[PDB]
Structure formats: C-alpha cells, structure tokens
Symmetry: C3
Subunit: 307 residues, 3 copies
C-alpha cells in the first residue's frame, strides 16, 4: 500500500491508555483503518521510519508472551526502539518503590507499557509519569489494547461488528480481557446479543455490568447468562470468545459441529484445555490470526500516541 | 556535527575505570557535550552518530538507572544493544569471566560492566580489545555516576568550584561517593566537604589519603559528622545522600546506623533549615533516608539527576566511539 | 558487494546435511566480504525493518549473542523474548509459543534440550527457524562457522587431518561438523578422540559410511591425544565433557607449525589457558568468524 497514508488518530496523541472507556466509535474505526494500512505496508515489505529515535520501555511486573512481544515488535516496525528493562534484574530488589521505578524509566523513554498484578498500580504510575503509559493489564481490571485488537479481529474476519451475537466464555470474573471487550463493544457498537458463559462463581462482575446497564437497555442489547456452551449459544453466536481460568464450556472439534459456518472462535491466549488443539485446523479458528492483528493494532496505537 | 556535538577527543577508544582518569578540561568538555545532547534530543532531533555500533551490557548486579540509561543513550545516538543476560549464559556451564569478556568482545564495540568484585574490571581489561565502561565494581567506583553528578551540580547551581557539599550515608561501601569525592577534589576547588556517616561507615582511608595533597593545595575544609547538624544544613549547597547497604550488615555498623538513622534522614522538616538555593541529590535507589515529603521541593534534584545521566552517557559513548 | 546465497532464501536451517559444497563456499565468501566491510567501518542496512526472535530454552553465550549481533549489523532488529518471563509459566505449549513469536518475527532462532523440538516448531511456523542446537542432535551454524574458521586460518579444507576430541556422543557441534566435512570435502583423516563410552554415535557414522569409503577417508579411534594425533593433525577440535585428552602448552610442543586448535566453547579444563597466547589458538577468532558467518546466513535466508 505505497500510496496509502498513515494518518495518526489525533485523539490519542500524547495520551495514556488505561481503559476501553476512553475510546469512541470513531476512534476505534480510525484505529482499525490505520492498523489495516499498517498491515498492507508491512506485508508488502515497506520499511517504516515513523518513530526513529523514540523509545518504548516495557514494565512487566507479571508474565507475558503476546502483549510484551507484540508491543516490542510494533515499536520496532515503526522504526522505534526498545530498552529491555527487566523488573527481576532491577533496583526493586534493593527496595526501590513502584513510583520511583516509574520515574526512573520515565526519565529515558517516550512511552511506557505497563502490566501489573495490582489493579490500582496503573493509576499510581500515571500520578508520577510525564510520558504516556499504556496499560498492558492491571490485575483483574482491564486490558484495553486487547479489546482493540479483538475488535479489529472481529471486523476483519466477519466484516462487521454491529449486529453480532458474541459469547464471552470462561473466567469472566477475573478476565481483564472480557471486562475491556464487553465495555468496548457495548459502548460503541449495536451488539445484538451477548452470552455470558461461566460457572456462577466466575460470572461477569457487577462492576462491569452496572455501568453498562443504561446503554444495554437503550440499545436493546440482549444479555443471556449460561453455565454451559448450550446448543443455543453454539448455533447463534457469530463469535465464541473463550478464556483460560485465571463446566461443559470446552470448545473442541465435536462441539464445533454445532457452530454456524460464518463465525469465528477467539481466545486472547495463553490457552489451556478449554480450547482443544482439535479446533486449530478449522478455518473458523481465528485465535492465531488474532495475535498478528494485535501487532498491527499496536502499531496503530503507538504511532497515534507518539506522532 | 563537529560544531554542535564535537566528541571529547581524549576519550576516544579508551576504557573508563576510575574518576581519577579525567582532567578538569575533560569534565567540562563532557558537560558541555551532554548539554548539547540534551538540547538536541529535547527539541525532537534524531541522531545517527553511532549507527551500526553495538554496546553489550554485562551486569552481574541489579541495576535500574545505569543499565537503562546506557541502553537509552546508545539508542539515542543511533547505536544498538545486544541484550546479553548473565543468568542465561555459559557462565552456568563454568565459563570464566575472562572467557565471557572475550566472547562479548568478539561482537561488540563497547562493553558496559557492573560486577560485585572490585578487581573484576581490571581482569576484564586484561583480555578485551574494545573499551569497557565501569558501571560499578564492588565497593570501588562508579565513574560515570560521578560525571553525571557533576553535570547535575553544574547545571542546577551554575558552578562547581566553591561549593560546600555533604556526602551522606554509607560512605564506606558507597562506590558513588568514592568516585564523586575523587572527581570533585582532584578537578575543582571545593570549599568544604561534610562527611556525614556513622563512624563504622565513614569514608575510607583508601579514598581520603591519596586526596590529601589536593585537599591541602586547594585548602578544602573536610569535616566528619554523624548527623545532619544545623551547620551542615545551613552551609551546604549540595546534600548528596545515599542508601545504607543494610544487606551487608561486626555488629557495630548495624547498631551505629540505627542510632544515626533519624539524624541523617532528609525530610521536609529537616529541609526547613536548608538554604533557599541548593540541591538535594541521591544516586538512587533510595529507601527511607530520603523522604517522599521532599519530592515536591524545587530543591529536589534527584529525579532530574537521572535524566542528566542519560545525556552524560550520550556524551561519553559518542566520545569513546567517535 | 554482498550477493545473498540464493539456495538459502526463505528456508529453515536444521541440519548440516542440507548444504552443498557450493552453498558452503558461497557462504564463506559472503561472510569474508561482510567481515571486510564491517572491519572498514561500513554500515549495512540490508535487513532494516526485519525481526529476529531468539527462542533459547537452554543457556547460551556465543550462539545467542552472535545471532543478535549479526542481525543488528545487517540493519535488522531483535525482539528479546525470555522463556522464564513468558506464558509458558501459565501452561502454554511449545507449539503455541512458536505460533506466538512467529506472528511477529521474520526469523526465529531456536535452541532446545529436546532433539525433536525443532521439528515440532517447524510444523507450526510460517517463517524460517534456525536451529541453534537441538539436544544432542546438531548445531548446523556452528559447523558452518567452524568450516569458515578452517578455511580462513589454514587455506584448504580438502586434505586436512582433523581430530575431534571430547564428548563425541553428546556433542552436537561435532555431530554437525563431521557431517558437513565428510559430505562436502575430501578429508584425509579424522581422529575420533574420546573415552569409549563417549565415542561418536553410530547414528552419525553410519549415514556417512558410503562417503567415507568412496573418498577414502581414514577414520581412527583413540582414547587419548597420542603423539601420532598431535603430530599429524592440521586441526585439533576439542570439546567440553558434557588427563589423556587435555590440551595444554606442554602437549602443544608436539603439534605441527601449520595447524590450529579450535573449540566451540564454552571450555572447562580440557583446553588450558596456557595455550591462549599461541598463534595456533584459533578458538577466540572462531567466535568472530561466527558472527560473520551468521551475517551471511541471515542475509541469505531473508534476502
């Protein structure tokens, strides 16, 4: 896509990303279009130099394969650079506080990408940092860029987000990904139906559902709770989005015989047994492609924040 | 550009081991270069001076500032970093330090080394062909900390000559204060140094004795205290404090440290006695010796200090590798 | 300039068996060309915007660092993935980990303690994988750089007498080197110097038996560095065991003038530091040849 422009999404300039709530529908589509243009240029072999001389520092206080690697790769493919700071090798072992660690990396960097097991640690970091912080996961709170890349996956695979029926399956209580995704979808799209598929003990929290209650009612979004992947959930869902425990909810090839032809199976990953390897060969299995869409969404995000 | 960012010629191709190796002219040249680096980077300019050159960090101790600032400085000059980790290396298979140095020296343009043995730097120099920069050698030295500390004093106060500085905390084990005292006394006309520490953690004789000539020649006043007395607070232009390395605490250091701890803590209450214009510095990391109540004070320079460190390390890397 | 070796384009590197003599010389000439340019201070931009991800499930100093340095010196970039800080801790399978890094990267460099792990990785990855060591199997790029070292230091590879010394049973470097040399060169003699319990495996020797016979390669086993091995060998290639076989200055008094000592490293006491100052000690130079061979390989794969 040599003649394609890469206009940054202006609303994101210089801003930290903490919640799916911060995005408008217009922002999301602008990011989607920007991510697709990124994908076309990169896949054609174009070299981008947009962020030369800019530094991202990862601040991962919990493990990560996709989010860490995707953000590093995205920065590099924009022409930016990464300082490979490791918490386990740092002055935190001599009692340095979180706030002083943030100030330290903020001294050298243009953007910080932070994942932390405490839900309020992001707000603490924002209180002392001069540069933008991107929330890569805050305890069982949110994972806002996962929601963005999930929505890019749905859009790219199915062609439309408005009108879908989506099942959110698994550990909904502790699942930061489904918290952000439900917020992003309900606030900004005309979703037909959401199945919330989980054991009662792991159901979607009231602190996610209640803020959405007014929009759910006014937009007429149907919310249906189940504790199993019933035939109804299988037959009606355009998207099955499943998650790992942080029940009769396993997705395997046998279960997929009930699914419609035009639908996708998604999973933020990593997975355990809830999503069988028997599904991997199915054209409807989108969870590996989902990871690559993440890299391009993170390119669109980084360029928009730092342009 | 040779107008804007001339390298400090004296540093070309040379290892940096000690604050002793620098002259006054070298230090001012680095200071002016670091200020030019800051100007350019803060204006958004992208530098390509070190494209194709590689720095490899070789950290055998933890670090937040020194590792990250060297990496960032290398990147901001257009160079690159090989992220070698000691814990994932052939050291686990019995590879010697010397062979490890030879290995990384095979691929790199500069090595940045921190090691818990004071003599490890010399051992590495004995086999490396490329420059090694000492990022801290046991309780010996931290020469680039001293350079960035001096940039900080110069930039914040306007002058290094004539200052009264208190060095506070674990002076015995503090590689940063060893290098800073050497750099300052050898190359500037310091008015007075307060050495503020429990007796067991005082500044070592191996640091003070070689400096006695410069101290006499320049008439530097040296006073030991075990407290931030009203006199230290009223007279100091720079309070440079450090963390007690309590993980090293025969029982005298622990007991004397505890006895002195409140007297050597800087907090908002103690700052009421400080000069209107002065700075508080700390190489970091800090623990409770430097209270968060001081962080909002304009005199708190220890966060700015870290950014000055990045620019000083750009000045250093560019001068070594130009 | 720097023409890539066309036969390597887009291919994974798994075994010394996959290379022809023409491939090896092309890689040697390209690596020497890159050395000339890099040593002259020239900056290469051949792989700007391309990413290598190292995936090391075993320790490494040379292979990891040399691959990263090689990628960087071609203008490429590295995503610094660590097994210990990854989702493997949450039960992620090797297959899924490969799929994950394959989503972001242009090339994966993989070392793993299981011999069959590289094949498993190949079965799911779309981008090339370079085998940086697969259990006690092979280490194909070590063999390539070893051969560059012999060429550059001695001038001919055909016609040499080479001793392979140490733990030949478990040594993936000697497995690959024996394959690469016997398949593609006319070697005069190989001394296999090892305790009986650690001798070169039959699963390495038997596939080579036809080549050995048709090229008339002499194969001798010893359990010690005898005077004959020391006097006749053009290359002493020694390895770490994971008295009779130690190389030190005393033993070097028996070596010919025109020979080299090599060691893939790391070493323990089997190669004394007393040898290090000898002009014949090539094992440090060998590491630098490795960086340039890896530049030649990465460029040829990704061109």
């Amino acid at each position: 896509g040599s003649m394609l422009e890469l206009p940054p999404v202006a609303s994101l300039k210089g801003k930290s990303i903490t919640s799916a709530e911060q995005f408008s529908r217009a922002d999301i589509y602008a990011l989607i279009h920007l991510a697709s243009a990124m994908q076309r240029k990169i896949d054609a072999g174009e070299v981008l130099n947009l962020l030369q001389g800019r530094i991202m520092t990862p601040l991962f206080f919990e493990d990560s394969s996709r989010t860490f690697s995707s953000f590093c790769a995205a920065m590099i493919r924009l022409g930016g650079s990464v300082v490979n700071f490791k918490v386990e090798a740092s002055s935190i072992n001599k009692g340095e506080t979180l706030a002083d660690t943030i100030r330290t990396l903020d001294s050298y960097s243009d953007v910080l990408v932070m994942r932390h097991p405490r839900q309020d640690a992001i707000e603490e970091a924002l209180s002392v940092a001069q540069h933008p912080i991107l929330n890569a996961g805050n305890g069982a709170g949110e994972h806002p860029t996962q929601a963005l890349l999930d929505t890019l996956t749905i859009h790219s695979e199915l062609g439309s987000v408005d009108g879908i029926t989506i099942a959110l399956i698994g550990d909904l209580k502790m699942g930061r990904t489904v918290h952000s995704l439900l917020k992003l979808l309900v606030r900004n799209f005309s979703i037909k139906c959401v199945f919330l598929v989980a054991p009662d003990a792991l159901q979607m929290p009231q602190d996610v559902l209640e803020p959405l209650q007014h929009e759910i009612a006014t937009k007429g979004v149907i919310i249906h709770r189940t504790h199993a992947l019933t035939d109804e959930v299988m037959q009606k869902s355009d998207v099955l989005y499943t998650t790992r425990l942080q029940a009769d909810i396993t997705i395997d090839a046998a279960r997929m015989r009930l699914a419609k032809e035009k639908m996708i199976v998604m999973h933020p990953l990593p997975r355990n047994d809830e999503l069988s390897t028997t599904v991997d060969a199915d054209p409807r299995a989108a969870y590996f492609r989902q990871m690559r869409y993440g890299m391009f969404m993170r390119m669109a995000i980084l360029w928009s924040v730092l342009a």
